[PDB]
Design a protein around this ligand. Sequence first.
Ligand SMILES: *[C@@H]1O[C@H](CO)[C@@H](O[C@H]2O[C@H](CO)[C@@H](O)[C@H](O)[C@H]2NC(C)=O)[C@H](O)[C@H]1NC(C)=O
Ligand SMILES: *[C@@H]1O[C@H](CO)[C@@H](O)[C@H](O)[C@H]1NC(C)=O
Lengths: 186, 128, 145, 413, 49
Amino acid sequence: VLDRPEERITGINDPRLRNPSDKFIYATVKQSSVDIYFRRQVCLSTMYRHMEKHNYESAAEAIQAVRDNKLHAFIWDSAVLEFEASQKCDLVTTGELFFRSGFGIGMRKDSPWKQQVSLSILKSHENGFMEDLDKTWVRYQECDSRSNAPATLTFENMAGVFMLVAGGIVAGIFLIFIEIAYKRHK
Amino acid sequence: QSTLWLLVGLSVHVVAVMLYLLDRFSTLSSAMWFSWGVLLNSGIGEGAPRSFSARILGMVWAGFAMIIVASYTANLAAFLVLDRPEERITGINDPRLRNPSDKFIYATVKQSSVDIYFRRQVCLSTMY
Amino acid sequence: TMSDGTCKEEFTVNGDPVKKVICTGPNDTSPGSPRHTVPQCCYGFCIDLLIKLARTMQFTYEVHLVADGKFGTQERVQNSNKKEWNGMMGELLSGQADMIVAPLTINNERAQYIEFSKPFKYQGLTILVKKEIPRSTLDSFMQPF
Amino acid sequence: EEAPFVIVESVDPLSGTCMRNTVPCQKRIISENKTDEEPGYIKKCCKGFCIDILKKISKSVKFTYDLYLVTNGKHGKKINGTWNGMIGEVVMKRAYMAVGSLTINEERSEVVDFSVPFIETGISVMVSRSNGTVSPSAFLEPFSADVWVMMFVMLLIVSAVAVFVFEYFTIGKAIWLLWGLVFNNSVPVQNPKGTTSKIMVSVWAFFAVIFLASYTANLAAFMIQEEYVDQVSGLSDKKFQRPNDFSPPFRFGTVPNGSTERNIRNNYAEMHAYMGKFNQRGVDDALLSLKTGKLDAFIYDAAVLNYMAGRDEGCKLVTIGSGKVFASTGYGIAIQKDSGWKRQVDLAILQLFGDGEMEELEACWLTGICHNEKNEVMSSQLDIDNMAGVFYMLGAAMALSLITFICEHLFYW
Amino acid sequence: LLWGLVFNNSVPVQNPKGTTSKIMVSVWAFFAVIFLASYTANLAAFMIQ
Ligand SMILES: *[C@@H]1O[C@H](CO)[C@@H](O[C@H]2O[C@H](CO)[C@@H](O)[C@H](O)[C@H]2NC(C)=O)[C@H](O)[C@H]1NC(C)=O
Ligand SMILES: *[C@@H]1O[C@H](CO)[C@@H](O)[C@H](O)[C@H]1NC(C)=O
């Protein structure tokens, strides 16, 4: 139990996310919505500076840099990142959702297609259409993996004592040789 | 659960008599003493079954009983931690202090300062 | 795309025909390139939704990726005073587009100049970090010794 | 009046007008005798989630407002092309806005406007409590299979060579002593040849005790486990789809003439027809009839069901979880059509989302005891499947003993 | 023999009188293994400090 890693990272309340040290880096995508949210936040300014120092250009690059242990933690959207984690695999999400908002089609002001598209989107939410899209190729197509467990026994664990096996055996060969030689002498 | 308890009491005897009849085909009672002891890791010894493979199977069943006692000590080490009381009460944020149930009672002194503080508090009215 | 001009079709797990569309745009290389406005081919959740929507509303269209990969935010450019909408938001607000179908967030900063539909997928924000297995076997006979 | 989104109260037996952080909400009872009239004007005062929302909006964009409860119909449905309930009160010009627990769909949007949704919600399924079982099947996890047989063959070969060099016997001797080392059991210890071989088995016992300490610790570690399941997987599940098999999971609650009602009716007609036998008295009757055994499956707005599951004594439950939400839409603030207020109200609610203030409202309006602390008492040797598999391995060993005895009888003669 | 039961060590096991006394030490070993499981678990518990 003692040799358990620092395996605890929560949402935006943990002091670590507030007093940044160069052991960790938290990055995002430049010019992104997350940048707006963090900028117009009163008492996260230190975090915002330290983050602005190391942001990226695209989501995929950051995913890769996290896979290569250059970037320690990533703060991005929830759907994209959840799929990317559960699917690729051996990456995990920690913490609870905080900036709960939605996605949406965009339009310049005053196009009648706005009034039409809103009704269309609702109709589509009703027919389960969106649901079957999601089930089709958003989720349920991943490295669906369970939770963690303590470590097991491996060969590197046994090597330290297998040496005493062969070492004792060669010592015993030499020892029986010399003991029989001595019993032949006296 | 009396089931994992009672199953071995019959399995030991049936496998012992099985190997005993095997040796008879080419010691019975001594084989029973032996199987009970080797399950219990007794300081009581006797002779092994005559053939090689019969005592081979005996030693396999011995490894099985070893896994049994390992499971038992593991389960006791578990029950150590599992039977821990609800020993966690924090300041005024825990939901329990917010959704009161008649299992707990939180009291103060009437006309006291604490009563003022809790009264002029917006979303602790149920608690109050 | 394949050399035939399109990109070859395929099939889902159920053998269903994956819809695809021809989408021009980037230089095929954003970091280092003059520009190569080359035809690509797109397909995605949003693409499916766009297809259904259009069939429901009698559109006709052509998709093109954004010029510089950035979602969009406000900025005051250098050597001027006019603060400008960056990236894709700008490509909409300038006149280069009539709609923006993508994973776009919703917040009042954008909602000043744009009109939003109802949300079509709720979500939030969260953090990703690498998962590590390693055990701690080290001179097992010696560490407690 | 509804679940924590809006609450009503008697005013104040101490002060004549009620406490701080509350809004006076009037009620017009019209249910007295029909003799002359009485518009029952009682001043009560209301408080809750949506009340706080509008209390902040009004200060942000400078309304003033009375507050006006409603009588004819709970929420609202179409009736001969007419609307009752809150929507009815809106279309009849008696109110610009309606607040509180109100959904969003297509049919309402056809006649009234809608602000931007400020809480996502949808359909869900609540059932009785669930229980778990034993997750592990065999206790081989404390080592890799490769570890296991690698050690196996290494030990066997070293034993054989130690015998072959000590003679310079009785294979059973070496085998049984090795197995006694690994199992710490009493063994028929023959052939104790007094030589260096004794030092060899001393080192053997060294290795064996180290390995057994490692194994017991590893099993103590791997003993940590948990389990849970729910025996329904969506509105598309066969039970709901085919509610006429042998199993009658029955009496789906679905308080009538709300929203989920009409959604179900427009999608699953036979489910509606068979669902004609249901629960009709709000949410309290639902929870009761679920507790007794009068029914097993409830269907209502997730936004109140997850809360009810949270602040509940004991622990009942909903279907698998959030990932099971059907036709996800959100609550809103329905304002009259084409009013100029719409853009400003929308922008103000977005402003609230921005500065992280919905956190406070979720913090002290929406929390539960059992909506946390996911764990279970670990499984002792109650695993009948694990032990049954081990016993099946034992019986296979018995059969192998039979067959090798037959083969030895054949090889002798 | 009693100390070997409590300690599970190799002992110079003399006098194995074959009678009911053998059933007696069988129950002895039952108690001993239960007690040793209890002791190892208890030490695992008290190790937290
Ligand atoms: C659902 O529809 C029924 C159908 O009208 C509504 O109510 C009924 O109950 C009222 C009060 O007892 C009566 O005044 C109505 O005459 C009666 N209607 C019929 C056809 O019997 C009911 O209020 C609606 N809402 C709910 C939640 O049930
Ligand atoms: C319409 O009105 C008739 C009586 O005029 C009534 O019987 C019927 O139930 C009503 N139906 C609807 C859908 O309003």
